Ligand binder design. Structure first.
Ligand SMILES: CC(=O)SCCNC(=O)CCNC(=O)[C@H](O)C(C)(C)COP(=O)(O)OP(=O)(O)OC[C@H]1O[C@@H](n2cnc3c(N)ncnc32)[C@H](O)[C@@H]1OP(=O)(O)O
Ligand SMILES: [Zn+2]
Ligand SMILES: [Zn+2]
Length: 157
């Protein structure tokens, strides 16, 4: 099994190892800390055997909606990053991480929608998001450094 808690400063070292193990977008350490500091209530880690094996890093933004047809300002949550170590996958960890963060985005930060980008070939992540009722909003052409497209995916909270 596993447990969930809010991320702390001393988790950063492990969050970074997980990020570099699982994703090509390898942010600097200060990028993680700023999100921990500013939006920490929605920033969660998954713990197995006393170690972090998964994380979700949020940002709460103010600006134009990804959902509403006409240009309108909203508080929107942004899943900047989420990852789970390979050996602990398919156990419901990312689902739980996402759910906890979405709840905090709504209850702590009063966000009314949540969004993210994901590589079009990332079927496990896309499946994960769609299972949580995210919808593909549009294709972002050449979004990634290597030129791969992303799906912008979003939903109300
Ligand atoms: C904004 C984001 O950062 S975009 C990038 C996301 N992060 C990454 O891609 C990093 C590498 N990949 C991973 O860490 C993981 O595969 C994650 C984060 C996508 C999923 O973590 P998991 O804990 O394994 O997801 P979880 O166990 O909650 O599974 C939820 C559902 O997603 C789907 N899913 C997860 N993995 C797969 C897979 N390999 N194949 C098909 N569907 C999958 C399933 O529908 C699953 O439910 P089910 O198997 O019971 O039917
Ligand atoms: Zn993003
Ligand atoms: Zn709270």
């Amino acid at each position: 099994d596993f447990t969930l808690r809010n991320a702390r400063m001393d988790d950063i070292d492990q969050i970074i190892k997980i990020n570099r193990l699982t994703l090509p977008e390898n942010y600097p350490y200060y990028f993680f800390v700023e999100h921990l500091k500013e939006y920490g209530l929605a920033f969660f880690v998954a713990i197995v055997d006393n170690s972090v094996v998964g994380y979700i890093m949020p940002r709460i933004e103010w600006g134009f909606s990804n959902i509403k047809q006409l240009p309108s300002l909203v508080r929107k949550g942004h899943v900047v990053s989420i990852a789970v170590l390979e050996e602990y996958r398919r156990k419901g960890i990312a689902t739980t991480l996402l759910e906890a963060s979405m709840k905090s985005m709504k209850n702590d930060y009063n966000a009314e929608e949540i969004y993210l980008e994901v590589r079009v070939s990332n079927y496990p992540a896309i499946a994960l998001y769609e299972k949580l009722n995210f919808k593909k909003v549009k294709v972002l052409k050449g979004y990634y450094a290597d030129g791969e497209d992303a799906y912008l995916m979003a939903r109300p909270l």
